[PDB]
Amino acid sequence: YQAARIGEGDEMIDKMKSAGYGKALDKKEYYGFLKILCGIERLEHAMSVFKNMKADGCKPGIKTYDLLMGKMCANNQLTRANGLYKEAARRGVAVSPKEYRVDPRFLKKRETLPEKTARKRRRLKQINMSFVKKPH
Amino acid sequence: GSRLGRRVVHFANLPIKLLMPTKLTNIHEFALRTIPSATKIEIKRVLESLYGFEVEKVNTLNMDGKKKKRGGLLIAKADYKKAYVTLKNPLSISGDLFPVKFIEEDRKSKVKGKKSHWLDQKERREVGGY
Amino acid sequence: GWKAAEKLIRHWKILRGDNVMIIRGKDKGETGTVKRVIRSQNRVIVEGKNLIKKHIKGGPDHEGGIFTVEAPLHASNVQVVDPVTGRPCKVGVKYLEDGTKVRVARGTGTSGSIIPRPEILKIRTTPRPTTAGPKDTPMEFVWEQTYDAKTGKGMPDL
Amino acid sequence: PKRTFQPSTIRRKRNHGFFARKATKGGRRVIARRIAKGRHRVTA
Amino acid sequence: SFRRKRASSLDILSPKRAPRDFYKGKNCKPTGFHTKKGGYVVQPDKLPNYVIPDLTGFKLKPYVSQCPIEV
Amino acid sequence: VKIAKNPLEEFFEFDRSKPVVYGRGWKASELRLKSWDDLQKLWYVLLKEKNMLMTQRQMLQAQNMMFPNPERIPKVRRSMCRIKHVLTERAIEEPDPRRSAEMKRMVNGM
RNA sequence: AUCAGAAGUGAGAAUGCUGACAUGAGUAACGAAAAAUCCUGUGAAAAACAAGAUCGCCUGCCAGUGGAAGGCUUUCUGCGUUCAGUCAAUCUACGCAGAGUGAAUCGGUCCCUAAGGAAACCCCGAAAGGGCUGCCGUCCGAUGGGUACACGAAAGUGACGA
RNA sequence: UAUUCCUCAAUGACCGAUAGCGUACAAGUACCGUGAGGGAAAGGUGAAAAGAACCCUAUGACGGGAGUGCAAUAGAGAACCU
RNA sequence: UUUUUUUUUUACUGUAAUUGUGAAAAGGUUGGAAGAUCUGGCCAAAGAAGGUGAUAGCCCUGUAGAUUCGUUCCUAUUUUU
RNA sequence: UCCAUGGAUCUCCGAUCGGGAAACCGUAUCCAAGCUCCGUGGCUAGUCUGCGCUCUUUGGACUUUGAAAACUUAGCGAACU
Ligand SMILES: [K+]
Ligand SMILES: [K+]
Ligand SMILES: [K+]
Ligand SMILES: [K+]
Ligand SMILES: [K+]
Ligand SMILES: [K+]
Ligand SMILES: [K+]
Ligand SMILES: [K+]
Ligand SMILES: [Mg+2]
Ligand SMILES: [Mg+2]
Ligand SMILES: [Mg+2]
Ligand SMILES: [Mg+2]
Ligand SMILES: [Mg+2]
Ligand SMILES: [Mg+2]
Ligand SMILES: [Mg+2]
Ligand SMILES: [Mg+2]
Ligand SMILES: [Mg+2]
Ligand SMILES: [Mg+2]
Ligand SMILES: [Mg+2]
Ligand SMILES: [Mg+2]
Ligand SMILES: [Mg+2]
Ligand SMILES: [Mg+2]
Ligand SMILES: [Mg+2]
Ligand SMILES: [Mg+2]
Ligand SMILES: [Mg+2]
Ligand SMILES: [Mg+2]
Ligand SMILES: [Mg+2]
Ligand SMILES: [Mg+2]
Ligand SMILES: [Mg+2]
Ligand SMILES: [Mg+2]
Ligand SMILES: [Mg+2]
Ligand SMILES: [Mg+2]
Ligand SMILES: [Mg+2]
Ligand SMILES: [Mg+2]
Ligand SMILES: [Mg+2]
Ligand SMILES: [Mg+2]
Ligand SMILES: [Mg+2]
Ligand SMILES: [Mg+2]
Ligand SMILES: [Mg+2]
Ligand SMILES: [Mg+2]
Ligand SMILES: [Mg+2]
Ligand SMILES: [Mg+2]
Ligand SMILES: [Mg+2]
Ligand SMILES: [Mg+2]
Ligand SMILES: [Mg+2]
Ligand SMILES: [Mg+2]
Ligand SMILES: [Mg+2]
Ligand SMILES: [Mg+2]
Q1: Which residues pair with B82 in a beta bridge?
Q2: Chain C 67..96 CB hits on strand I (< 7 A)
Q3: Does residue F12 sit at the B interface (CB-CB below 8 Å)?
Q4: What is the spatial distance between Cα F22 and Cα C135, in angstroms, rounded to a whole number?
Q5: Contact F60 B99 (CB under 8 A)
Q6: Long-range contacts of range B95-101, CB-CB < 8 Å, 24 or more positions apart?
Q7: Which terminus of chain F has a smaller tally of CB atoms within 10 A, N or C?
Q8: ∠ CA F41-B41-F73 to the nearest 5 degrees?
Q9: A and F: touch, per 3+ CB pairs < 8 A?
Q10: Which family does it belong to (chain D) (predicted)?
């Protein structure tokens, strides 16, 4: 997941499930995976891992929703963060209004004399190349 | 990332042009040509990382490119760097490789114009330079 | 002594493989096929026509003797044969139903028929090799996709 | 006999070199006149 | 390859054609620092490291085959 | 012979025999299918081929002999240029700023 | 053509200008009181080239060794004789082509300063600029002082003529 | 209203290789001078290279034939029209 | 949010389409070669110009235009604090 | 091949980060913020927190204007004749 090999990471997760070590995939390891995936800007696969975590029986507390809401607000997507707020309210998690700062990357926003000289240089070459070449 | 070092090169582009040695066996040193901005450590680490040479020492020298002048018209070749690489163990070059036979025949064309004792060494190192 | 201030012909209405008639010079009134076009001289070579005699001194590699070969003709000295009437004709530009440039016969006394692009043009002069060399990658290895941006397959070692 | 030109590279660079010309207003005028004529050798 | 230059470029000073205390250099990257006794200490942090993978077992070759393939 | 017996013989064309043929250069669309590891391995394969070719040209011209098939050198050169262009394309499309800067540094480092 | 018009409109001379070619003339000269001789070979051609033998000249300022200053490939090897060499040269500091210069210690770079130069601050001046290098002061500059960290100093010094 | 380091288009009872810019040609070059600076010369085979295979005599073809070409004293290698 | 699209009409040194398109016949003679000459058709909003084996409106590249393309306007860039 | 548009790469002096015999030498600037990885320290030991660098992003701190013929406006201002 640090090398952004998300499909191979998911396959390794399933392979760990097949080997009988699925009980060691607790909420701490899944939160570490989410922190790694949000830290390298893979928010969609982070949501996929979050959905798999919810389907695995692991119960996300306030830290997982804090991380995901902060990453969604940093990417200037307040609607999805509010949607996760409503989902965490439905699940029964102690959640609060909070100011998450938006990243300053996703926030919305005559020919000169040397150029004339270069154009004339190009035209002078073009004139010389328009004639029949003398064989030699 | 940058935790590994300050100057980490993943795509090296150092040109190495081997000069043909005089002998085909017991090669303790050989010479190559490269660009003048190459250093001894760059040549050594490229030659041991990319080719697996057992490099003992690298000596370098700068040469001006060949020039021809006819009073206003001057044509020239690039300056280059010549590197002498001494090996920890001797190597050899196969006779049938192209173009070793042609090079040896041309070189011999341009040069046309028992009493051993006890404990006498037979294949000793022959290294030039300082 | 190439003394004229002659400009290059930029868009040629005279192509390799065309059937033409020489309309000027020593071989005036003779037909042939365009073997080769020399664009840098505004000249063409018609197969078997405009013959010269070269006194070539035989070295260690080639052979000596007096050889007969074609000399180039100026591109304004040949004219495309009308495919219906068989006479030399000028060439016009007609746009087809799809919108493709074709050559048509032009001039009073011409049929206006389409002058077809020669079939020899689609053939490679340097044919493709039959057997791959020892450093040539086979095409099945070239097409093996080891990178995928969606699933992150083939990422670097960051 | 001993002649007027006794070469010394460092004296040539200190009297007629590029930065020797750049150090004075007259030398900068020499460089400007020199480029305006189109000489290949701007400084000696 | 031979390439044309100006004859005036032969007047640019080179240490091969200079007094013995003229130093120019060839834009080589430094590997350390000068000492004040005239020596030099090479610092390994400024040395290049070349990451080169193992090439044995690799299937891709310098050229791509030009044999006739398919329409 | 078939295989180079030492690192010195990798500067020689051991496969040269019957005129030997050489393919074309790699295209950018074909290199866009390859992983970073495969592209780095292909870069070093091309680098060793280029070193061998310049060695052969230098050896033959030192004995006043012609260097055969001189178009092999620009084929390798253009393939290497396309490899670096494809890797820089992948660096630009990286959404993470740190990873994009590290990929650019890996490509352009000397 | 003709009739008119516009002139950078007419050469034998300006010790006129540029180019070409004569005369003197096959003349002077072939450049330091060390010096040549022969066998063989090469070649179309050999007093002048290769190799050898004999003879001579230089030995503390023309003549040997290593090198600074300057030069900048003249070095070496193969091919060659159009140019050059005071030659009819096969030879060459000449033409073509290829090759050759390897450093912890040599010489530099680097540290340190002299004479000197320049910035900063300050002073002066129609402009441009000129001065000032310090009472607290910076950066260059060997022809001299230095050779296995960094920082500091009310310690010694480095440190010197004939 | 002034000027042209510049661009585009056009004109000439302007010049035509000792003329016209110093430079029609790789010129601010070669060359000269310590330096500031001074400062050249040199255009044209033929329509097309078809640029003369081969023979003879010289060490050596640029010669004499042959052949190419309308024409070869139109046969040159920064130069061959007259 | 995005895509398809109703979209008027003319003007431009726009020295735009590097180098798009762009008209117009055949014989005889001489000559190395035809553009010359004799017979005899045709184009011109094109007889500016440069080539082609001599002096070519119709052999070639162009040239006048005509078409395309892109600036204007009709088609207000408005609304909220 | 070529064209149009948009991209990737893009050595050095002039020259401006410091030095300088132009085309060379030396150069991780400095300081606030928030983030993946990295390493070490400490608790009553679990989605525990607190200290750091390197490099990445957004800012703000020092300072880098800069050339160019003639025309214009000014300052000073000859001599030959
Ligand atoms: K006179
Ligand atoms: K000596
Ligand atoms: K002149
Ligand atoms: K003639
Ligand atoms: K037009
Ligand atoms: K014609
Ligand atoms: K005409
Ligand atoms: K007076
Ligand atoms: Mg050395
Ligand atoms: Mg012509
Ligand atoms: Mg001079
Ligand atoms: Mg250049
Ligand atoms: Mg030297
Ligand atoms: Mg540098
Ligand atoms: Mg690069
Ligand atoms: Mg007069
Ligand atoms: Mg007169
Ligand atoms: Mg007189
Ligand atoms: Mg007399
Ligand atoms: Mg007498
Ligand atoms: Mg006499
Ligand atoms: Mg004799
Ligand atoms: Mg001798
Ligand atoms: Mg003396
Ligand atoms: Mg020489
Ligand atoms: Mg010699
Ligand atoms: Mg020689
Ligand atoms: Mg002779
Ligand atoms: Mg001579
Ligand atoms: Mg020589
Ligand atoms: Mg030393
Ligand atoms: Mg002082
Ligand atoms: Mg002073
Ligand atoms: Mg001052
Ligand atoms: Mg200074
Ligand atoms: Mg100092
Ligand atoms: Mg000294
Ligand atoms: Mg002393
Ligand atoms: Mg003349
Ligand atoms: Mg004349
Ligand atoms: Mg003139
Ligand atoms: Mg001849
Ligand atoms: Mg004529
Ligand atoms: Mg056009
Ligand atoms: Mg037309
Ligand atoms: Mg005309
Ligand atoms: Mg004529
Ligand atoms: Mg600087």
Answers
A1: B33, B61
A2: 73-77, 79, 87-93
A3: yes
A4: 7
A5: yes
A6: B95/B24, B96/F1, B97/F1, B97/F9, B97/F12, B97/F13, B97/F14, B98/F12, B98/F13, B98/F16, B98/F56, B99/F56, B99/F59, B99/F60, B99/F65, B100/B20, B100/B24, B100/F12
A7: N
A8: 45
A9: yes
A10: Belongs to the bacterial ribosomal protein bL34 family.
- Resolution of this model in Å is 2.1
Chain C closest CA to A135's CA: distance in Å? 8
For F102, half-sphere exposure in the C-beta direction (CA atoms, 13 angstrom radius) is 17
Give chain C's count of helices (H) and strands (E).
1, 11
Q: Do chains C and F touch (3 or more CB pairs under 8 A)?
A: yes
2-41 of E, contacting B, C-beta below 8 A: 2-7, 9-10, 14, 16, 26-29, 31
Phi-psi region of B111 (alpha: psi -120 to 50; beta: other; left: phi over 0): alpha
Separation CA D40–CA D34 (nearest Å): 9
CA–CA distances in Å: residue B19 to residues B30, B33, B34, F51:
7, 7, 11, 12
> Which residues lie below 8 Å from residue C87, measured CB to CB, with a gap of 6+?
C21, C81, C109, C110
Cα angle C110, C111, C113 (rounded to 5 degrees) comes to 120
| Antiparallel, parallel or unpaired: β E3-5 and B8-9 | unpaired
β-pair partners for C51: C70
Cα–Cα dist C5/F97, whole Å: 59
Neighbours of F36 (CB within 10 A): 20
Residue numbers followed by a gap, chain A, C–N over 2.5 Å: 109
Least CB–CB distance from F26: residue in E52, E55, E64: E64
Method used to determine the 3D structure:
cryo-EM
- Phi/psi of residue F64, nearest 5 degrees: 55, 45
Cα–Cα dist F72/C133, whole Å: 13
Q: Which helix (H) or strand (E) holds C18?
A: none
